[PDB]
Amino acid sequence: MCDKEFMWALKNGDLDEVKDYVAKGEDVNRTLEGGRKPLHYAADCGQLEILEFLLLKGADINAPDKHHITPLLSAVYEGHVSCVKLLLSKGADKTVKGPDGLTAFEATDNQAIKALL
């Protein structure tokens, strides 16, 4: 068990492997070796099922990574509409500014995400 495989599981949708790490003692809020938290890796790659599992285990929906980026901003940057919907419906702060100074509204050009914000 190592962080490198944990980050891969969150990125690639391996929910069972993510459940393995958590059941074996992993903290769903710990910033991994890559500089991001589990929610950041799941939201960046649009893993909707992992996002749900992480929040139910107590993951901070607004926690930043090492680059002042929230899980909501990470999902917006790659246009994961369903992930934006789930994070917003769970109370994600839409007013946080990214590392470039723009909020989730100003950072995206996809108007479908802009409507939900």
UniProtKB/Swiss-Prot annotation:
Other information: This protein is produced by a bicistronic gene which also produces the MPD6 protein from a non-overlapping reading frame. MPD6 belongs to a group of cryptic antigens without conventional genomic structure. It is encoded by a cryptic open reading frame located in the 3'-untranslated region of MTPN.
Function: Promotes dimerization of NF-kappa-B subunits and regulates NF-kappa-B transcription factor activity. Plays a role in the regulation of the growth of actin filaments. Inhibits the activity of the F-actin-capping protein complex formed by the CAPZA1 and CAPZB heterodimer. Promotes growth of cardiomyocytes, but not cardiomyocyte proliferation. Promotes cardiac muscle hypertrophy.
GO CC field: cytoplasm; cytosol; F-actin capping protein complex; nucleus; perinuclear region of cytoplasm
One Pfam family here: Ank_2
Repeat positions for ANK: 2-30, 34-66, 67-99
Tissue/organ expression: Ubiquitous.
Subcellular location: Cytoplasm; Nucleus; Cytoplasm, Perinuclear region
Expression triggers: Up-regulated in heart left ventricle of patients with severe coronary artery disease and history of myocardial ischemia. Up-regulated in heart left ventricle of patients with dilated cardiomyopathy.
Protein name: Myotrophin
Record-listed Phosphothreonine modification sites: T31
GO BP, sorted A to Z: neuron differentiation; positive regulation of cardiac muscle hypertrophy; positive regulation of cell growth; positive regulation of macromolecule biosynthetic process; positive regulation of NF-kappaB transcription factor activity; positive regulation of protein metabolic process; regulation of barbed-end actin filament capping; regulation of cell size
Organism: Homo sapiens
Family: Belongs to the myotrophin family.
N-acetylcysteine: modified positions: C2
Oligomeric and partner information: Interacts with RELA. Interacts with the heterodimer formed by CAPZA1 and CAPZB.
Keywords tagged on the record: Acetylation, ANK repeat, Cytoplasm, Nucleus, Phosphoprotein, Repeat
Lineage: superkingdom: Eukaryota
InterPro entries the UniProt entry points to: Ankyrin_rpt (IPR002110), Ankyrin_rpt-contain_sf (IPR036770)
Record carries keyword Repeat: yes
Residues annotated with N6-acetyllysine modification: K4, K11, K24
